[PDB]
């Protein structure tokens, strides 16, 4: 179970609403939880991009925003996604050992 | 008349004797002659059997683990000694115990006994296999789809323990690939050229009896001849 | 091209005596008409030698003329290919 | 050594360095113990080698084996490349090495740069026709 | 001034052993089983409710003769026959159909193209091309890297000369030769059965030399230009390389030829002479 | 997967980009060794595999090749309208010729 975003709830486009989140990355997630001792809560929440380096309103031009955003704003601390390997996020970000080509 | 006009001229046939019949059988005659070079074109169209039906499977199919269930069964074998060997006896080990008759003394053999039918699949490693496949001079072989490996991995390199300077080579690595260089230099060294021409054709030189099947219906004609020949009683009773 | 030409000629006098032995006459005339019509096509009302073993020539005419045939075709839509 | 990653021929016949080979790579033997000669080593991860001390700035000096094929473990010792780093006889294993659970125990590794497995090979077979082509030039409505 | 690769031009020859190649050796002999089951089964079906006679009509339908008389009579025989007829028709279809499509792909193996040719980078046995010993050509491949395997094949087959490569490539115990472009487009021009092929790979210009201070290159160089310009060099040309001019078209399709269908021709023969002795038996038991 | 699934549309090419997917965290979590350890564990004994064979490479809609155009019932269609042309000008032909003779 894990929270969505706004569009999710189509009232307004601000407020959240869990929903059934599901697939096989959450498998591996659940393996990991399971023999990596702890406990989690998944929430589905961004504007719906990965979120590469983008430009700004010309302040000062070093954001990433999105899934990078949540990473390294303090807002998550793990991404369980298909994220790609790329040498720009492999300056901030630390990777694990590749799982799928 | 007209089943002989249409397949082929076969016996002495009464003609109409009408002056305007003969018109009727003339234009079915057309219509003959049309359909049987329209029917013998397409099939010389048809008999040229494209190369590669390629045989595709998957890695935990019953076309392995059950080898005896098929007609007359793979054989399929590997390196002893090696690696590989401890990479599937910790999983399966029923298929091991099974392919134990069909070891290879090294590998140039296992390409040899590949091309002369002694064996029919063949399973190793990746890399060495995808240089192989692209190097042998016929090349009429070729390895599955490399999207279903078994046990991925990566060739890699070490360093000591501690993080000497670990992350450095790790930028470059990375920039390395990023600029697309990797690709130049398999192309360079790795690759080799025929992984193109996908599929020739060929003749095939048609010698079974294929045309089983059509002795089949010619024979079934014959069957439904004897019922027909049932109305020998059905006057007899009558 | 010619080969056929010489060993049509050569049959054909096979037939005038053939026939001679065994048992509307079947001359070297209407004989080379016969074999005519074989190879190329079915054209038209031909005697047939009455005779019990001249059949046997002419069948074996015949089966040459099939395979003759479709050899010819088959090459020609060989050339065809542009 | 091996096939397609790192070759090992000779020195040059006219001068005995090397033309585009760019490492004597130091071809130690034992048989005290020498390092006897210096054979010119080309190659794959030799040339992955050179693109990348491009870049890092630092030098180097490829240095043979001679323990083990390898690496394995033996009455929890290692011997071949891995036992070579282990102890830092060395200070970094190059060439054709695959990544497994206990040696990214023992050893760190970088980030794989092939990718490699477990794979099949077939024999791309002929194939003949239909059994039922006679009847195949003409659908149901002709 | 490039290099590029002579071979010989094959020219086209049918391979068509015999007429009886589009068949297995043993559908032949299922056929006349077939035909002798259909005969004596018409026989049968026929008066129940004339051997030869029927014999006769089933040896015609299938061998599209004319010859032959009987026509069944009876309802059960005439189902047969015409589906007898059919399978006919379908067996002689099937044949002409398979003898093309065998024929259609008879085109001959392509020749190399270039340098990146598969039968050429990975060697083998079957396709033997070298160059002359210790030339330049031998040291560009040693001096090469991205690909040595074929030199290795190239290096056991050099000729130390010209005029035997060439001569061995007119007696086909050497698939190719690699060499200059200059001396090959002539030396084909002027044989005229023998054809270059690639594209110049390797590439320079030549030119005249002399010490690095001759009071005289500026002239030169001067001289050079304005022969090429005024179309001095291209009368050259044309008077010394490529005058002779034996150019073609592309080839044609095989001809299947005086043997290479022989056996049927030596088949009706054969029903001849046996003929002969078939006579010579009827009439006496007759 | 979306080819699989449908089993009327092909995909082709040969992979000419190419990455590997993987798990982020920040540059210090302490966490990241023990998380590339559980996933070479895992990509050894199988488990990969049976997700995989679950969850992307199930439905399994693969074929071998094609066969060669089959001419229709519209491709010649016209040769039996001129046979029924024929006899309805047949019809025609008959009065005229009985009234004739
Ligand atoms: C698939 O390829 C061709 C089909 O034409 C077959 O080739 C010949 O096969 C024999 C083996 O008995 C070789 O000796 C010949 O060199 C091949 N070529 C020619 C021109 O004859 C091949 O055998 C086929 N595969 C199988 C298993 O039959
Ligand atoms: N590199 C592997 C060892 C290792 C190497 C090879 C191999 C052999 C020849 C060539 Cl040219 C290339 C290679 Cl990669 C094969 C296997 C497979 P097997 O030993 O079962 O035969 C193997 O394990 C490791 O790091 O443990
Ligand atoms: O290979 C040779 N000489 C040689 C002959 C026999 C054995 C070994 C070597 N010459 C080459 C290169 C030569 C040059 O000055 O570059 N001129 C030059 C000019 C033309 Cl037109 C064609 C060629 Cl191949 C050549
Ligand atoms: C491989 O294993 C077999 C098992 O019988 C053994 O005989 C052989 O010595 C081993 N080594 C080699 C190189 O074959």
């Given at each position: 179970?894990?929270?969505?975003?706004?569009?999710?709830?189509?009232?307004?486009?601000?407020?959240?609403?869990?929903?059934?989140?599901?697939?096989?990355?959450?498998?591996?997630?659940?393996?990991?939880?399971?023999?990596?001792?702890?406990?989690?809560?998944?929430?589905?929440?961004?504007?719906?991009?990965?979120?590469?380096?983008?430009?700004?309103?010309?302040?000062?031009?070093?954001?990433?925003?999105?899934?990078?955003?949540?990473?390294?704003?303090?807002?998550?601390?793990?991404?369980?996604?298909?994220?790609?390997?790329?040498?720009?996020?492999?300056?901030?970000?630390?990777?694990?050992?590749?799982?799928?080509? | 008349?007209?089943?002989?006009?249409?397949?082929?001229?076969?016996?002495?046939?009464?003609?109409?004797?009408?002056?305007?019949?003969?018109?009727?059988?003339?234009?079915?005659?057309?219509?003959?002659?049309?359909?049987?070079?329209?029917?013998?074109?397409?099939?010389?169209?048809?008999?040229?059997?494209?190369?590669?039906?390629?045989?595709?499977?998957?890695?935990?199919?019953?076309?392995?683990?059950?080898?005896?269930?098929?007609?007359?069964?793979?054989?399929?074998?590997?390196?002893?000694?090696?690696?590989?060997?401890?990479?599937?006896?910790?999983?399966?080990?029923?298929?091991?115990?099974?392919?134990?008759?069909?070891?290879?003394?090294?590998?140039?053999?296992?390409?040899?006994?590949?091309?002369?039918?002694?064996?029919?699949?063949?399973?190793?490693?990746?890399?060495?296999?995808?240089?192989?496949?692209?190097?042998?001079?016929?090349?009429?072989?070729?390895?599955?789809?490399?999207?279903?490996?078994?046990?991925?991995?990566?060739?890699?390199?070490?360093?000591?323990?501690?993080?000497?300077?670990?992350?450095?080579?790790?930028?470059?690595?990375?920039?390395?690939?990023?600029?697309?260089?990797?690709?130049?230099?398999?192309?360079?060294?790795?690759?080799?050229?025929?992984?193109?021409?996908?599929?020739?054709?060929?003749?095939?030189?048609?010698?079974?009896?294929?045309?089983?099947?059509?002795?089949?219906?010619?024979?079934?004609?014959?069957?439904?001849?004897?019922?027909?020949?049932?109305?020998?009683?059905?006057?007899?009773?009558? | 091209?010619?080969?056929?030409?010489?060993?049509?000629?050569?049959?054909?006098?096979?037939?005038?005596?053939?026939?001679?032995?065994?048992?509307?006459?079947?001359?070297?005339?209407?004989?080379?008409?016969?074999?005519?019509?074989?190879?190329?096509?079915?054209?038209?009302?031909?005697?047939?030698?009455?005779?019990?073993?001249?059949?046997?020539?002419?069948?074996?005419?015949?089966?040459?003329?099939?395979?003759?045939?479709?050899?010819?075709?088959?090459?020609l839509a060989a050339f065809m290919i542009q | 050594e091996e096939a397609p990653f790192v070759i090992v021929e000779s020195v040059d016949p006219l001068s005995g360095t090397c033309m585009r080979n760019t490492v004597p790579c130091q071809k130690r033997i034992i048989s005290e113990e020498p390092?006897?000669?210096?054979?010119?080593?080309?190659?794959?991860?030799?040339?992955?080698?050179?693109?990348?001390?491009?870049?890092?700035?630092?030098?180097?000096?490829?240095?043979?084996?001679?323990?083990?094929?390898?690496?394995?473990?033996?009455?929890?010792?290692?011997?071949?490349?891995?036992?070579?780093?282990?102890?830092?006889?060395?200070?970094?294993?190059?060439?054709?090495?695959?990544?497994?659970?206990?040696?990214?125990?023992?050893?760190?590794?970088?980030?794989?740069?092939?990718?490699?497995?477990?794979?099949?090979?077939?024999?791309?077979?002929?194939?003949?026709?239909?059994?039922?082509?006679?009847?195949?030039?003409?659908?149901?409505?002709? | 001034?490039?290099?590029?690769?002579?071979?010989?031009?094959?020219?086209?020859?049918?391979?068509?052993?015999?007429?009886?190649?589009?068949?297995?050796?043993?559908?032949?002999?299922?056929?006349?089983?077939?035909?002798?089951?259909?005969?004596?089964?018409?026989?049968?079906?026929?008066?129940?409710?004339?051997?030869?006679?029927?014999?006769?009509?089933?040896?015609?339908?299938?061998?599209?003769?004319?010859?032959?008389?009987?026509?069944?009579?009876?309802?059960?025989?005439?189902?047969?026959?015409?589906?007898?007829?059919?399978?006919?028709?379908?067996?002689?279809?099937?044949?002409?159909?398979?003898?093309?499509?065998?024929?259609?792909?008879?085109?001959?193996?392509?020749?190399?193209?270039?340098?990146?040719?598969?039968?050429?980078?990975?060697?083998?046995?079957?396709?033997?091309?070298?160059?002359?010993?210790?030339?330049?050509?031998?040291?560009?491949?040693?001096?090469?890297?991205?690909?040595?395997?074929?030199?290795?094949?190239?290096?056991?087959?050099?000729?130390?000369?010209?005029?035997?490569?060439?001569?061995?490539?007119?007696?086909?115990?050497?698939?190719?030769?690699?060499?200059?472009?200059?001396?090959?487009?002539?030396?084909?021009?002027?044989?005229?059965?023998?054809?270059?092929?690639?594209?110049?790979?390797?590439?320079?210009?030549?030119?005249?030399?002399?010490?690095?201070?001759?009071?005289?290159?500026?002239?030169?160089?001067?001289?050079?230009?304005?022969?090429?310009?005024?179309?001095?060099?291209?009368?050259?040309?044309?008077?010394?390389?490529?005058?002779?001019?034996?150019?073609?078209?592309?080839?044609?399709?095989?001809?299947?030829?005086?043997?290479?269908?022989?056996?049927?021709?030596?088949?009706?023969?054969?029903?001849?002479?046996?003929?002969?002795?078939?006579?010579?038996?009827?009439?006496?038991?007759?």
């Amino acid at each position: 179970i894990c929270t969505g975003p706004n569009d999710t709830s189509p009232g307004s486009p601000r407020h959240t609403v869990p929903q059934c989140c599901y697939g096989f990355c959450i498998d591996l997630l659940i393996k990991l939880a399971r023999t990596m001792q702890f406990t989690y809560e998944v929430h589905l929440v961004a504007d719906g991009k990965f979120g590469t380096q983008e430009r700004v309103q010309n302040s000062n031009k070093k954001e990433w925003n999105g899934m990078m955003g949540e990473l390294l704003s303090g807002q998550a601390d793990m991404i369980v996604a298909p994220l790609t390997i790329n040498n720009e996020r492999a300056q901030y970000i630390e990777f694990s050992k590749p799982f799928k080509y | 008349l007209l089943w002989g006009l249409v397949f082929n001229n076969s016996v002495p046939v009464q003609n109409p004797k009408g002056t305007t019949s003969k018109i009727m059988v003339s234009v079915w005659a057309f219509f003959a002659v049309i359909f049987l070079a329209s029917y013998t074109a397409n099939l010389a169209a048809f008999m040229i059997q494209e190369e590669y039906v390629d045989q595709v499977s998957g890695l935990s199919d019953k076309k392995f683990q059950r080898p005896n269930d098929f007609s007359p069964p793979f054989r399929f074998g590997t390196v002893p000694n090696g690696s590989t060997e401890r990479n599937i006896r910790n999983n399966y080990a029923e298929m091991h115990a099974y392919m134990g008759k069909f070891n290879q003394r090294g590998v140039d053999d296992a390409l040899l006994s590949l091309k002369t039918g002694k064996l029919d699949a063949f399973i190793y490693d990746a890399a060495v296999l995808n240089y192989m496949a692209g190097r042998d001079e016929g090349c009429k072989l070729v390895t599955i789809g490399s999207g279903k490996v078994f046990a991925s991995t990566g060739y890699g390199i070490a360093i000591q323990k501690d993080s000497g300077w670990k992350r450095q080579v790790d930028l470059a690595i990375l920039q390395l690939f990023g600029d697309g260089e990797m690709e130049e230099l398999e192309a360079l060294w790795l690759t080799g050229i025929c992984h193109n021409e996908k599929n020739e054709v060929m003749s095939s030189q048609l010698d079974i009896d294929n045309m089983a099947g059509v002795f089949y219906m010619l024979g079934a004609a014959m069957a439904l001849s004897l019922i027909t020949f049932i109305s020998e009683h059905l006057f007899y009773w009558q | 091209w010619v080969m056929m030409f010489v060993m049509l000629l050569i049959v054909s006098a096979v037939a005038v005596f053939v026939f001679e032995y065994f048992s509307p006459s079947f001359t070297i005339g209407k004989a080379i008409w016969l074999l005519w019509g074989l190879v190329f096509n079915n054209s038209v009302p031909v005697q047939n030698p009455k005779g019990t073993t001249s059949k046997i020539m002419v069948s074996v005419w015949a089966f040459f003329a099939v395979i003759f045939l479709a050899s010819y075709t088959a090459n020609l839509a060989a050339f065809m290919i542009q | 050594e091996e096939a397609p990653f790192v070759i090992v021929e000779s020195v040059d016949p006219l001068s005995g360095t090397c033309m585009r080979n760019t490492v004597p790579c130091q071809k130690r033997i034992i048989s005290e113990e020498p390092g006897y000669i210096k054979k010119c080593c080309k190659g794959f991860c030799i040339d992955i080698l050179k693109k990348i001390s491009k870049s890092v700035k630092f030098t180097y000096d490829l240095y043979l084996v001679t323990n083990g094929k390898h690496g394995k473990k033996i009455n929890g010792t290692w011997n071949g490349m891995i036992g070579e780093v282990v102890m830092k006889r060395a200070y970094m294993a190059v060439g054709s090495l695959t990544i497994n659970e206990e040696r990214s125990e023992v050893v760190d590794f970088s980030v794989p740069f092939i990718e490699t497995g477990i794979s099949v090979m077939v024999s791309r077979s002929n194939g003949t026709v239909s059994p039922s082509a006679f009847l195949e030039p003409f659908s149901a409505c002709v | 001034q490039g290099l590029t690769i002579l071979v010989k031009k094959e020219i086209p020859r049918s391979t068509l052993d015999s007429f009886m190649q589009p068949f297995q050796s043993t559908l032949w002999l299922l056929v006349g089983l077939s035909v002798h089951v259909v005969a004596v089964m018409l026989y049968l079906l026929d008066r129940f409710s004339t051997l030869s006679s029927a014999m006769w009509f089933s040896w015609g339908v299938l061998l599209n003769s004319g010859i032959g008389e009987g026509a069944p009579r009876s309802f059960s025989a005439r189902i047969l026959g015409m589906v007898w007829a059919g399978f006919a028709m379908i067996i002689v279809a099937s044949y002409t159909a398979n003898l093309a499509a065998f024929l259609v792909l008879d085109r001959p193996e392509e020749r190399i193209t270039g340098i990146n040719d598969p039968r050429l980078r990975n060697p083998s046995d079957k396709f033997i091309y070298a160059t002359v010993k210790q030339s330049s050509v031998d040291i560009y491949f040693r001096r090469q890297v991205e690909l040595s395997t074929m030199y290795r094949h190239m290096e056991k087959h050099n000729y130390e000369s010209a005029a035997e490569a060439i001569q061995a490539v007119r007696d086909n115990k050497l698939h190719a030769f690699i060499w200059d472009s200059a001396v090959l487009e002539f030396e084909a021009s002027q044989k005229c059965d023998l054809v270059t092929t690639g594209e110049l790979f390797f590439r320079s210009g030549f030119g005249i030399g002399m010490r690095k201070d001759s009071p005289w290159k500026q002239q030169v160089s001067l001289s050079i230009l304005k022969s090429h310009e005024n179309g001095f060099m291209e009368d050259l040309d044309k008077t010394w390389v490529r005058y002779q001019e034996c150019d073609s078209r592309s080839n044609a399709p095989a001809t299947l030829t005086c043997e290479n269908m022989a056996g049927v021709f030596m088949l009706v023969a054969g029903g001849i002479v046996a003929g002969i002795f078939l006579i010579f038996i009827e009439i006496a038991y007759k």
